[PDB]
Design a protein around this motif. Structure first.
Motif, PDB file in Angstrom:
ATOM      1  N   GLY A  13       0.897  -1.280  -0.202  1.00 34.14           N
ATOM      2  CA  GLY A  13       0.011  -0.125   0.114  1.00 34.14           C
ATOM      3  C   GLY A  13       0.787   1.156   0.204  1.00 34.14           C
ATOM      4  N   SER A  14       1.783   1.254  -0.792  1.00 35.41           N
ATOM      5  CA  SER A  14       2.788   2.127  -0.778  1.00 35.41           C
ATOM      6  C   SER A  14       3.182   2.701  -2.227  1.00 35.41           C
ATOM      7  CB  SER A  14       4.111   2.069   0.072  1.00 35.41           C
ATOM      8  OG  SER A  14       4.727   0.961  -0.502  1.00 35.41           O
TER       9      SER A  14
ATOM     10  N   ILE C  98      -7.020   6.887  -2.063  1.00 34.62           N
ATOM     11  CA  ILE C  98      -7.464   5.947  -2.951  1.00 34.62           C
ATOM     12  C   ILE C  98      -7.415   5.955  -4.310  1.00 34.62           C
ATOM     13  CG2 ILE C  98      -9.752   4.591  -3.226  1.00 34.62           C
ATOM     14  CD1 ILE C  98      -8.508   4.708  -0.405  1.00 34.62           C
ATOM     15  N   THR C 110      -6.674   0.707  -5.787  1.00 33.54           N
ATOM     16  CA  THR C 110      -5.494   0.369  -4.863  1.00 33.54           C
ATOM     17  C   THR C 110      -5.584   1.656  -3.752  1.00 33.54           C
ATOM     18  OG1 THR C 110      -3.172  -0.461  -4.416  1.00 33.54           O
ATOM     19  CG2 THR C 110      -3.490   1.436  -6.086  1.00 33.54           C
ATOM     20  N   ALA C 111      -4.687   1.282  -2.558  1.00 35.91           N
ATOM     21  CA  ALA C 111      -4.479   2.267  -1.601  1.00 35.91           C
ATOM     22  C   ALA C 111      -3.183   2.573  -1.416  1.00 35.91           C
ATOM     23  CB  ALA C 111      -5.217   2.002  -0.182  1.00 35.91           C
ATOM     24  N   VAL C 112      -2.930   3.879  -1.086  1.00 35.28           N
ATOM     25  CA  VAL C 112      -1.493   4.260  -0.575  1.00 35.28           C
ATOM     26  C   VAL C 112      -1.881   4.831   0.742  1.00 35.28           C
ATOM     27  CG1 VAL C 112       0.668   5.654  -0.979  1.00 35.28           C
ATOM     28  CG2 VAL C 112      -0.820   4.766  -2.972  1.00 35.28           C
ATOM     29  N   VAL C 113      -1.193   4.154   1.528  1.00 42.17           N
ATOM     30  CA  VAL C 113      -1.279   4.546   3.073  1.00 42.17           C
ATOM     31  C   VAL C 113      -0.056   5.140   3.574  1.00 42.17           C
ATOM     32  CG1 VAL C 113      -1.844   3.799   5.340  1.00 42.17           C
ATOM     33  CG2 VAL C 113      -2.995   2.896   3.235  1.00 42.17           C
TER      34      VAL C 113
ATOM     35  N   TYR D 105      -3.522  -4.581  -0.331  1.00 39.04           N
ATOM     36  CA  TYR D 105      -3.951  -3.257  -0.626  1.00 39.04           C
ATOM     37  C   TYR D 105      -4.716  -2.762  -1.843  1.00 39.04           C
ATOM     38  CZ  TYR D 105      -1.639  -1.913   4.033  1.00 39.04           C
ATOM     39  OH  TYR D 105      -1.306  -1.769   5.097  1.00 39.04           O
ATOM     40  N   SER D 106      -5.175  -4.059  -2.577  1.00 37.57           N
ATOM     41  CA  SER D 106      -5.702  -3.491  -3.983  1.00 37.57           C
ATOM     42  C   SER D 106      -6.610  -4.661  -4.142  1.00 37.57           C
ATOM     43  CB  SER D 106      -4.749  -3.691  -5.037  1.00 37.57           C
ATOM     44  OG  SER D 106      -5.080  -3.253  -6.355  1.00 37.57           O
TER      45      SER D 106
END
Ligand SMILES: COc1cc(C[C@@H](C)[C@H](C)Cc2ccc(O)c(OC)c2)ccc1O
Ligand SMILES: COc1cc(C[C@@H](C)[C@H](C)Cc2ccc(O)c(OC)c2)ccc1O
Lengths: 116, 115, 116, 115
Positions: A13-14, C98, C110-113, D105-106
């Motif tokens: 998630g990066s 998001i 996908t998510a970038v956290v 995460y996806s």
């Protein structure tokens, strides 16, 4: 810049940081000539690969070293690398963002093409 | 077969039919040696590319002619083709399914590797 | 901001502009309470949905109106909308991007956290 | 069956096995009425959810319990679940395959709709 690459990691998630990539341009004789290279920053982005004057019409190949990325995280992935091959500037100059989302056994790539 | 490719069309929600592809094995001199090819069936699948005896460890490339596919539909595509490059059989023979999803400006590929 | 949404169009090779979305937060009684809404800009981005103080721990739902997007382009897509449901800030405040890539019969999110 | 769901794991390159899902039809009062459920097989597939007589036009939701899947693997996931919401049969009955690819995460979903 006319050519930017953005890479995200779907497992963590990066952004995908320190991903190496090489850009090639197809020469008159049909061989791939080296054009530019670099690695992604902390934001998963690679900027400054080329200039509007240097980035003439042609067929370009961006080879993204996804295997080394995953290996450095302890993962043995499926793909050796991710490739994006496209004709650029066929109808005049455009700006190109190549975006990739990475998982160990999958990758997805899209392009955002904008008229200067 | 130890190797199957499945191609899907994300614009139309269908198998991508009559899509040509070539499969290459990397030779000792770092060049790509062609060895198999075909086009996808009505279900978007291509089977019978190789046999377990022939499909030895090595680095393989599947080059899918996505540009011709979108051209036949009258849609201007971004990519010249879609490539999948992978090392096969690193720890014994596996069955590989490579699935590719196509849009005019995007493609995705996933591998299902079973034992 | 703590919550940003970015949407790309895989058919046109562009940001997905003017995509409506609604954000909900799960209440004590298990119902979805409206939290924020907006539409994507010319860059396919929606910023300014919330603040660090307002964006407390909880389960959030982002409902992206992909059907209206495609319909306005003449396309009858598969999905009614794209949904992203997640627990936010469970281990302290984070910033969330998001990202969604849209095709008529497919979507990927996908998510970038990132830690503030 | 008119409706099949296939779930794949993008971390491990495998079918996502024993993944629970529920299917809902939207009721006249805008609420979600459950009507079918199951868990994926060893091939990551769930068949036999409905019949052509029962699978009438309407808005359907498939809610896939991806969080439990990643928890069983000891991996912390982003999403609570993955949803697929679609109108079915707008112009006659179709066979629907919904394919979902999972990462922590996806997630991605694609429909193959055939006649
Ligand atoms: C291997 O068998 C299949 C694979 C697939 C591929 C499908 C699971 C995914 C959604 C294709 C895909 C891969 C990566 C992505 O980012 C993606 O985004 C839409 C879509 C579809 C149907 C199948 O029978
Ligand atoms: C417009 O260029 C950008 C695009 C993006 C988003 C880009 C990383 C896309 C959403 C990544 C992506 C590629 C392929 C996918 O299948 C995907 O699924 C969400 C996501 C971020 C910053 C940018 O400057």
């Amino acid at each position: 810049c006319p050519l930017m690459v953005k890479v995200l990691d779907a497992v963590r998630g990066s952004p995908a940081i320190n991903v190496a990539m090489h850009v090639f341009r197809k020469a008159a004789d049909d061989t791939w000539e080296p054009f530019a290279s670099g690695k992604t920053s902390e934001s998963g982005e690679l900027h400054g690969l080329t200039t509007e004057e240097e980035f003439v019409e042609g067929i370009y190949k961006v080879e993204i070293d996804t295997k080394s990325y995953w290996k450095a995280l302890g993962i043995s992935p499926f793909h050796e690398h991710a490739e994006v091959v496209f004709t650029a500037n066929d109808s005049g100059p455009r700006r190109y963002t190549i975006a990739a989302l990475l998982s160990p056994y999958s990758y997805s790539t899209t392009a955002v093409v904008t008229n200067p």
